[PDB]
Structure formats: structure tokens, C-alpha cells
Amino acid sequence: HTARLVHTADLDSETRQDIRQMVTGAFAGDFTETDWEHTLGGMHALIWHHGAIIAHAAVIQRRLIYRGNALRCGYVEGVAVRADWRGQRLVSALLDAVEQVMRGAYQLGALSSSARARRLYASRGWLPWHGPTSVLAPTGPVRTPDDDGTVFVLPIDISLDTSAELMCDWRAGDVW
């Protein structure tokens, strides 16, 4: 149980489908077409057991604007461990892989965490954002209050004032 990293373009149709179905099941169905689209394009950390995917996390590239700078961010999407495999720290192995990618390629990692996972991210050195969050929408900056309190960041090569504004870039569905 060490995770393997595979870019989206290296997944065959069968594997891509196994991943989407496992993740959707792990979120008990609370996983939409846009949530799935948000897991695509970057590196997937995958753990298998007998040809079955039992754990997944994806890290995709985007920009987060902090103090006027568009920081190169590794954004974590779709972190999930199959229900019958929970409580064995498989998530720790997924994050070891995701974090290795962030140290090698990004200025910071970030994600919008489900409440049950917040203790886990904090224990690993992720920081909860306290300042107001926004998104740079096509019409300009728009606050995203529904996502306040869910965003976490992992600084790699920058010290951060986590009470400053933080503004993610645009996409469909949930922007955070």
C-alpha cells in the first residue's frame, strides 16, 4: 500500500471508469459530472487491491491569486477510500503521493475539504484559510462565502498570511 501516480492521459477507458465509479460511491453519490471533470488533467494517486481501485486522490494544476500574485497551485480533488477499506490509513498513502507532487512542481497545494477530513489535513501540516475566499469569475472577482471555512493550503516555497484574501480561478460547478 503505497500509491502509484498516473497522469490522466495515461489512464485507459476501463481504469478511468473504475476510478470515477469508486469515487462516486465513496462520496455516497454526492459527486457530480463537474466534480468528476475537476479531477481530470493532472496526476492521480491510486492504490489497487486485486485489480480493483481502492483509493484515489488527484492533484490538478490551477492558479490561486494571493496578494496580486497568481500562485502555481496543485489542487487536490476526489480524495476517496473505498468504504470497506476505511480506517486503515490508506488516505495517508494517497497524500504522501499528492504531497510529493506538490513539493516537486508547485508553490502551494490547496483543496476544499469535507468536514470529516479537516483533522487529517491539519495533522499533516495543511493550514485552514481564515481570510475571505473569492473566485475570479468572467465578470470579475466574486466572493465565495459558501466555501469559507473549507479551504486548506499547504505552502511549499512561500510563507503565507492565511487571513489575506485568496481568489481561485474560474471553472464550472464548485469553483473551490
Ligand X SMILES: Nc1ncnc2c1ncn2[C@@H]1O[C@H](COP(=O)(O)OP(=O)(O)O)[C@@H](OP(=O)(O)O)[C@H]1O
Ligand Y SMILES: NC[C@H]1O[C@H](O[C@H]2[C@H](O[C@@H]3O[C@H](CO)[C@@H](O)[C@H]3O)[C@@H](O)[C@H](N)C[C@@H]2N)[C@H](N)[C@@H](O)[C@@H]1O
Binding to ligand Y, residues 96-135 (CB under 6 A):
111-115
Residue nearest ligand COA by beta-carbon distance? 87
Asked if 20 contacts 36 with a C-beta cutoff of 8 angstroms, the reply is: yes
The residues near 80 (Cβ < 8 Å, ≥ 6 apart) are 22, 23, 26, 27, 55, 56, 57
Among 76-84, 85-93, 108-116, 121-129, which window interacts with ligand X (CB under 6 A)?
Answer: 108-116
**Considering the rule CB under 6 A, would residue 28 count as an interface residue with ligand X?**
no
Asked if 176 contacts 112 with a C-beta cutoff of 8 angstroms, the reply is: yes
Report how many residues bind ligand COA under the rule CB under 6 A: 17
Among 56-64, 110-118, 137-145, 156-164, which window interacts with ligand X (CB under 6 A)?
Answer: 110-118
**Largest Cα–Cα distance of the chain, in whole Å?**
48
Tell me which of ligand X, ligand Y, a second copy, none is bound by residue 50, counting a contact when its beta carbon lies within the kind-specific cut-off of 5 to 8 angstroms: none
Q: How many CB atoms lie within 10 A of CB 8?
A: 15
Tell me which of ligand COA, a second copy, ligand X, none is bound by residue 115, counting a contact when its beta carbon lies within the kind-specific cut-off of 5 to 8 angstroms: ligand X
Instruction: Report the alpha-carbon distance of residue 84 to residue 92 in Å, rounded.
Output: 16
Q: Is 30 left (phi over 0), alpha (psi -120 to 50) or beta?
A: beta
Smaller CB distance to a second copy: residue 65 or 82?
A: 65
Residues 64-103, one symbol each (x = binds ligand COA by CB under 6 A, - = not), give: ---------------xxx-x--xxxxxx------------
Contact residues: a second copy, CB under 8 A: 5, 7-11, 37, 40-43, 60-63, 65, 68-70, 72, 74, 100-106, 136, 138-141, 167, 169-172
The residues near 88 (Cβ < 8 Å, ≥ 6 apart) are 1
Q: Which residues are documented as binding site for CoA?
A: 79-81, 86-91
